[PDB]
Chain A
Amino acid sequence: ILNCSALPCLLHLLSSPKESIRKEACWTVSNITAGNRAQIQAVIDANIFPVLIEILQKAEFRTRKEAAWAITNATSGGTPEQIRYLVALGCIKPLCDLLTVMDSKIVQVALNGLENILRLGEQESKQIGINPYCALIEEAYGLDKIEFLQSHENQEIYQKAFDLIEHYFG
């Protein structure tokens, strides 16, 4: 149990040899990323998201789960500027990877994170009348993996999946 004054303190902890630390470091970042827009911006300024997305692919499962929560929270309370930054880092593919996992909770987290990115595309379409993130999700095999979830056991997942397809794709 411990506190930190500086934010780049954690950047060191996320690149440690011990998984047990990295996991809990990611869990802490997700609490910060759950906060307001300035708190999200702090994490962006400390260059933390680049290593989170690297973790979200390469790290072992228990760590990825917390790294996923962190990124989805960013997309939830983040500004259009901040979300575009995450997409530019290439967070869509890492999220689409999680869609096929066994844990229902982690699937919903991925679906929310993708939905947040897709709903931003609705605004961007008004501002070439097309959603730019539809193409990126399809190219990351996300479209098909969402299609799979339409036949999923859990009610909360299969309704979300059907909604995303009808609203943004089909």
Chain B
Amino acid sequence: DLEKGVVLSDLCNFLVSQTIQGWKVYWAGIEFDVTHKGMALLHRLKTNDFAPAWSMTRNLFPHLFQNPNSTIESPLWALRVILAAGIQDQLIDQSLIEPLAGALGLISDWLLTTNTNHFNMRTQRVKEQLSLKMLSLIRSNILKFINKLDALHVVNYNGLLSSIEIGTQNHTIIITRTNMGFLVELQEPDKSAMNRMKPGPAKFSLLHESTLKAFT
């Protein structure tokens, strides 16, 4: 009765409030503090208008910075991609009931593909699936994925893990930890952006350390 009203409000509304630092985001009962820090630099690295002679980050990710078919998105987009990835990683990989997977799938697709703050859920089979258990399941698995991201080390030349890849049917999300912060990038499922000769498309952005450090 009341449960549905609340569960819908929380899952189907990605609230964004503009602030001095950047944005205040609220979704699925979770607060996030997104910021502009790094985005200034991130643009200069791609267009190649920076002071120093070279950049270590620009060299490590040429499929992003030296790719004419890549484009930069906002930190809000970065957050959505991580959230979408958290759902896709922890949950959808296991074998669970099909209407639940389709529900999580739709929600991750809404986060990943669009920039809309409201999700008008028109698929009916899913709409009935929306429970407090479902919300609870998402919340915990978002937190797990964030802790999993916090466990990453900054890109290095040892054997220490520094990134995470999530491969869906239609996408490949890669989140790598750098000195700037978490470099979030979205490629085609065949990773066509890596093709050095004729590089495929890729959206990417930065999520600053601070946003995740609140949870750790």
Contacts and interface: CB of A to CB of B under 8 A. Distances in A.
Interface in A137-170: 138-139, 141, 143-145, 147-148, 151-152, 169
A61 interface: yes
B114 to A, nearest CB: 5
29 contacts: A57-B169, A61-B170, A61-B188, A61-B190, A98-B170, A100-B112, A100-B170, A101-B170, A101-B188, A102-B171, A102-B188, A102-B203, A103-B201, A138-B122, A138-B124, A139-B123, A139-B125, A143-B122, A143-B123, A144-B106, A144-B110, A144-B122, A144-B123, A147-B120, A147-B122, A148-B113, A148-B114, A151-B115, A169-B122
B109 interface: yes
A124 interface: no
Interface of A: 57, 60-62, 97-98, 100-103, 138-139, 141, 143-145, 147-148, 151-152, 169
Size class of the B contact interface (CB-based, 8 Å): 20 to 34
Interface of B: 102, 105-106, 109-110, 112-116, 120-126, 169-171, 186, 188-190, 192, 201, 203
A20 B155 CA distance: 35
A169 B114 CA distance: 21
